[PDB]
Swiss-Prot record, chain A:
Tree of life domain: Eukaryota
Intrachain disulfide bonds: none
Residue positions where N6-acetyllysine is found in the record: K157
Protein name according to UniProt: Cytoplasmic dynein 1 heavy chain 1
Gene name of the record: DYNC1H1
Taxon lineage: Eukaryota, Metazoa, Chordata, Craniata, Vertebrata
Disease implication from the record: Charcot-Marie-Tooth disease, axonal, type 2O: An axonal form of Charcot-Marie-Tooth disease, a disorder of the peripheral nervous system, characterized by progressive weakness and atrophy, initially of the peroneal muscles and later of the distal muscles of the arms. Charcot-Marie-Tooth disease is classified in two main groups on the basis of electrophysiologic properties and histopathology: primary peripheral demyelinating neuropathies (designated CMT1 when they are dominantly inherited) and primary peripheral axonal neuropathies (CMT2).
Function: Cytoplasmic dynein 1 acts as a motor for the intracellular retrograde motility of vesicles and organelles along microtubules. Dynein has ATPase activity; the force-producing power stroke is thought to occur on release of ADP. Plays a role in mitotic spindle assembly and metaphase plate congression.
Swiss-Prot record, chain B:
Domain of life from the UniProt record: Eukaryota
Gene: DYNC1LI2
Role this protein plays: Acts as one of several non-catalytic accessory components of the cytoplasmic dynein 1 complex that are thought to be involved in linking dynein to cargos and to adapter proteins that regulate dynein function. Cytoplasmic dynein 1 acts as a motor for the intracellular retrograde motility of vesicles and organelles along microtubules. May play a role in binding dynein to membranous organelles or chromosomes.
Binding residue positions for ATP: G25, E26, D27, G28, S29, G30, K31, T32
Subcellular location: Cytoplasm, Cytoskeleton
Full-sequence range covered: 37 to 373 of 492
Record's protein name: Cytoplasmic dynein 1 light intermediate chain 2
């Protein structure tokens, strides 16, 4: 699983967008009397010629910046979280089913638990949706939608096969011992001197 | 649940990531120019407040790609609160911080550094790091400093934050110009170098000179950054031989290695305040011409009333 733009792009581009929405109002040239007031014979300094003090002239204080970046630290953080989830499917390609079988040897019946949460793990996946949107960041899982699909489908199939296999074994146990005990009860010797 | 255990346990070989290199410096120091140029792009766009650079470090030895986060910070103090967006508990232990002292204006070096000496320090405690973890990382950094092979003392790391730190002084080419345009003595170079070395010593910092115009030690700076934030193989010796640009590895410093630089200059014995021995750059811009206020009708008219009374 790659990110064609790395997750840091999701933050850098948003920062550039915020910078653009600041420069649209900040890089405005400053009204200045130097048009004829040539007495200041000096190349106009950038931090005065271009009116670069507006950030300090906040009516509400710097809280605006605090909220803006916060939104980004919202937007990116959680979306990276979503990205994280997708990276978790990495296991579909590098794992040993023997390890799982040993770890959950003789669970509720054999596994009976992760075979339940896997169906929920079919989430973020196997849906008509092709790209997850969030704000101005759209993460498209187009190249993987079928690939991880086939892998996860086959893997779920094999886990189901193994589970139901030993379930059927235990039901052979079930019917065999029930029938034998039924015959033992059906000996029906209720009255006997011994 | 159970999956989050099993799938997580199936982990493969990777390289550490999420490292957070931080750059505070005095505004107008070309900090952005340095970080961009080292990134590879000649210069991105400047602006205000916090700025982000994803520094792509590739290791050909393992043939992998990683991105560290340059959180370069604006110099103005009113933009100090937003530093909470830069460093937090989950990010702090793997953060490296570099201050940038633009040598074009040596008169504004130490206090700017010392400004950092407040700001980050304040920010490191307003977040209320629990004492045990701060202590463990501090002693870890102390040990990592002590094991330099190509120490202990009263002032070594005598106050530090326990994360690796550099003092990257940019624009070193300018030292030539301000040498002749100002008659700025070479002994004064020795004095600033020694004082910066004392500063880096009490922070255990590795000091590097670098000139963007001279593209000097930019490769070396990249090497040292990758060595510290990641732990890559390092081979550069302690380049201190020439005074134009110097590279002081973190641990190569000693009190006597600053005493040797003290010896060669005999202008003013260095205990003196940095600012005194350096000469202030006098302000050029003239004060605006004074108000030509017009005397109001009232006191003026009272004055003529007095004049007619004199008649």
């Amino acid at each position: 699983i790659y990110l064609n733009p790395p997750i840091e792009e999701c933050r850098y581009k948003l920062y550039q967008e915020m910078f653009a929405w600041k420069m649209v109002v900040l890089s405005l040239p400053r009204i200045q009397s130097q048009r004829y007031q040539v007495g200041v014979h000096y190349e106009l300094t950038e931090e005065e010629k271009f009116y670069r003090n507006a950030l300090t002239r906040m009516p509400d204080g710097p809280v605006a910046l605090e909220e803006s970046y916060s939104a980004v630290m919202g937007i990116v953080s959680e979306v990276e979280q979503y990205v994280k989830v997708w990276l978790q499917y990495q296991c579909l390609w590098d794992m040993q089913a023997e390890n799982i079988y040993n770890r959950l040897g003789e669970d509720l019946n054999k596994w009976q638990a992760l075979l339940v949460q896997i169906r929920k793990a079919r989430g973020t996946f196997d849906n008509a949706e092709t790209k997850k949107e969030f704000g101005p960041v759209v993460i498209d899982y187009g190249k993987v939608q079928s690939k991880v699909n086939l892998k996860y489908d086959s893997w779920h199939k094999e886990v189901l096969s193994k589970f139901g296999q030993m379930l059927g074994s235990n039901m052979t146990e079930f019917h065999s011992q029930i029938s034998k005990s039924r015959q033992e009860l059906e000996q029906h010797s209720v009255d006997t001197a011994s | 649940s159970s999956i989050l255990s099993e799938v997580s346990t199936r982990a493969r070989s990777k390289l550490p990531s999420g490292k957070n290199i931080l750059v505070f410096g005095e505004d107008g120091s070309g900090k952005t120019t340095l970080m961009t140029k080292l990134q590879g792009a000649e210069h991105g766009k400047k602006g205000r407040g916090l700025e982000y650079l994803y520094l792509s470090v590739h290791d050909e030895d393992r043939d992998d790609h990683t991105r560290c986060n340059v959180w370069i910070l604006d110099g103005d103090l009113y933009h100090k609160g937003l530093l909470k967006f830069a460093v937090s508990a989950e990010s702090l232990p793997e953060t490296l911080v570099i201050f940038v002292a633009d040598m074009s204006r040596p008169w504004t070096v130490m206090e700017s550094l010392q400004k950092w000496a407040s700001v980050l320090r304040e920010h490191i405690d307003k977040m209320k790091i629990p004492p045990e973890k701060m202590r463990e990382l501090e002693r870890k950094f102390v040990k990592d400093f002590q094991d330099y092979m190509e120490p202990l003392g009263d002032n070594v790391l005598t106050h530090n934050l326990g994360i690796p730190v550099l003092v990257v002084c940019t624009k070193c080419d300018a030292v030539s110009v301000l040498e002749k345009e100002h008659d700025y003595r070479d002994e004064h170079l020795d004095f600033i170098q020694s004082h910066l070395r004392r500063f880096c010593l009490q922070y255990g910092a590795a000091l590097i000179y670098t000139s963007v115009k001279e593209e000097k030690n930019l490769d070396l700076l990249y090497k040292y950054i990758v060595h510290k934030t990641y732990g890559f193989h390092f081979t550069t010796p302690a380049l201190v031989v020439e005074k134009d640009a110097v590279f002081i590895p973190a641990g190569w410093d000693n009190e006597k290695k600053i005493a040797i630089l003290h010896e060669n200059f005999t202008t003013v014995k260095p205990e003196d305040a940095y600012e005194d021995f350096i000469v202030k750059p006098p302000v050029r811009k003239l004060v605006h011409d004074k108000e030509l206020a017009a005397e109001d009708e009232q006191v003026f008219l009272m004055k003529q009333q007095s004049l007619l009374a004199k008649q």
